[PDB]
């Protein structure tokens, strides 16, 4: 039985002795990487391509560095390469990917996350709200998901005001401050990067909108490492995230290898070949067999959009003690 080679790239010391416990054969290597940045990540991955033939990468980190996904998308698009982003910056949801990319992520799409937030907002009659975003992708997609749900709402959600903040530009004008004062509504929905949420919450603090009578709902793109809340954040915040506490790393790694290997099995069993690696520094047919996937009793299908059809969600509160609290699942 022929095999296929795969690399698992990790930043941060993890489980080794313990995350190990068919119709085609898999071949896994473990590669630690000291750094996360354009240069270093690109370099090590293509170095792995030229020293040995590798057909896919499962990538996980313990950081909030969202650009990892941005970068990995680029890489995938360039080398006909499957890349799984199973944790950390690799799992920060990357919208507007290359139409040719083979980069896929664990976690919920922005569509589903807006959906969950509205499920929540019904739970507390929060039928008045406002939306604040920066220029970060998913922005249009987020607010359009929500506005679409409101047009077909049989309840009059008062989408009072919605704000766009430009974060590629300086705020020596306080134009961000002035925009945020348009917010009077009790509930505010913030979509941006975690870093940007830090700055924007310094601002929303400075104009009293973090004060109570006010409550914020923010997706998983700002929760990040749910263990880290910088000293710049207000409490009583609400977020959604991938339930990384009850779905541990061994489970997602097992999923990561089994996705790729099931795809290899089926494509080779029917078209009689598995594409040969571009060590350079043609069909992505694998995508078909990477969308609809099943293994050892689990639904591992991705949407045609490029995100899990069944992400496991937890609904969390930043509480009395500045720690995220399971409040729903």
């Amino acid at each position, epitope marked *: 039985p*022929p095999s296929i080679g795969i690399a698992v790239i990790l930043v941060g010391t993890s489980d080794e002795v313990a995350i190990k416990d068919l119709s085609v054969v898999p071949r896994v290597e473990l590669v630690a990487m000291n750094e996360t940045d354009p240069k270093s990540i690109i370099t090590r991955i293509c170095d792995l391509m030229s020293d040995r033939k590798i057909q896919g990468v499962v990538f996980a980190d313990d950081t909030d560095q969202e650009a990892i996904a941005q970068i990995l998308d680029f890489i995938s698009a360039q080398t006909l390469t499957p890349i799984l982003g199973i944790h950390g910056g690799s799992s920060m949801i990357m919208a507007d990917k290359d*139409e040719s990319s083979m980069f896929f992520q664990f976690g919920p799409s922005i569509e589903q996350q807006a959906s969950v937030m509205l499920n929540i907002m019904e739970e507390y009659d929060w039928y008045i709200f406002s939306i604040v975003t920066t220029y970060f992708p998913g922005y249009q997609d987020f607010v359009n998901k929500i506005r679409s749900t409101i047009e077909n709402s049989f309840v009059g959600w008062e989408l009072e005001e919605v704000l766009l903040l430009d974060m590629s530009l300086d705020d020596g004008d306080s134009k961000i401050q002035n925009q945020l004062k348009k917010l009077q509504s009790p509930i505010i929905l913030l979509y941006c990067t975690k870093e940007e949420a830090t700055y924007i919450f310094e601002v929303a603090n400075s104009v009293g909108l973090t004060g109570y009578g006010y409550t914020w709902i923010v997706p998983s793109l700002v929760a990040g490492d749910t263990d880290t809340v910088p000293s710049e954040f207000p409490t009583g915040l609400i977020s959604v995230s991938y339930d990384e506490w009850d779905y541990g790393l061994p489970a997602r790694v097992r999923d990561g290898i089994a996705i790729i290997t099931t795809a290899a099995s089926d494509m080779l069993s*029917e*078209h*009689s*070949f598995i*594409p*040969e690696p571009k060590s350079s520094c*043609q*069909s992505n047919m694998l995508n078909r067999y990477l969308i609809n996937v099943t293994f050892e009793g689990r639904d591992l299908s991705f949407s045609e959009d490029g995100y899990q059809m069944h992400p496991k969600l937890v609904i969390i509160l930043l509480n009395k003690e500045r720690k995220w609290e399971r409040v729903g699942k």
Partner: antibody, heavy 117, light 112 residues
Framework: KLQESGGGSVKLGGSLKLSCVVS????????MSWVRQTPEKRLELVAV????????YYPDNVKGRFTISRDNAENTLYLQMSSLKSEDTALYYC????????????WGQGTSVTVSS | DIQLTQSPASLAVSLGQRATISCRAS??????????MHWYQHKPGQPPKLLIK???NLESGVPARFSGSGSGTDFTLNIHPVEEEDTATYYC?????????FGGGTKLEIKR
């Protein structure tokens, strides 16, 4: 380019080996195929083989009945047909490649196999 | 396992006019990112030559007169303008499921 050779007529349940001469490309990188033109002028896929033998595919019509071989050094496409039936009478073609990559890019000229006593 | 219906089975066209063959499949043979078909042609005593590469792709060596179109389950082979050099049977193919198949075939006999 390519040209078939080794055809003829043999009897039921017997065997016959067809092969084809290869010229002008890196033979060890292409995916090779054997197709059937039934004398009723309909085309049918007989067998395909990987870059080097890692997958020998036959439709269940000639599975077991046929077998493909490759010579990656002497650049030869090979197919032995055995335990033959009258059904296997046809014009047989060699075809090849789409480079990652399914379709049949380039075709041979065909040799005639007549199955009868 | 996938079926193929070529239509029409034979036709006659004036020289210089358009000519159209098409084919239907039992299943979707395309993704939302790309599409997977190919066309071939047959003169008498002929090596079958590739005409259309993927779905709407002119082969490196066949004249611009030929062009394909389609997706999902309906695919089309177009010849404009038609030559007598094109007198031929034509075959339709898919490469999705493991049994790659051909159509029943269709004949092009030139109006003369």
């Amino acid at each position: 380019k390519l040209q078939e050779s080794g055809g003829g007529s043999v009897k039921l349940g017997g065997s016959l080996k067809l092969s084809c001469v290869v010229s002008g490309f890196t033979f060890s990188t292409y995916y090779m195929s054997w197709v059937r033109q039934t004398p009723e002028k309909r085309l049918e896929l007989v067998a395909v083989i990987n870059s080097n033998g890692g997958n020998t595919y036959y439709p269940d019509n000639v599975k077991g009945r046929f077998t493909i071989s490759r010579d990656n050094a002497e650049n030869t496409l090979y197919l032995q047909m055995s335990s033959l039936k009258s059904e296997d009478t046809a014009l047989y073609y060699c075809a090849r490649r789409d480079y990652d990559g399914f379709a049949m890019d380039y075709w041979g000229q065909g040799t005639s196999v007549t199955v009868s006593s | 396992d996938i079926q193929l219906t070529q239509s029409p089975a034979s036709l006659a066209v004036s020289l210089g006019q358009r000519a159209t063959i098409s084919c239907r499949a039992s299943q979707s043979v395309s993704t939302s990112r790309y599409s997977y078909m190919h066309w071939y042609q047959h003169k008498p005593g002929q090596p079958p030559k590739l005409l259309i590469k993927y779905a709407s792709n002119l082969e490196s060596g066949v004249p611009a007169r030929f062009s394909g179109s389609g997706s999902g389950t309906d695919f089309t082979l177009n010849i404009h303008p038609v030559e007598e050099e094109d007198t031929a049977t034509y075959y339709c193919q898919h490469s999705w499921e493991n049994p790659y198949t051909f159509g029943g075939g269709t004949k092009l006999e030139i109006k003369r």
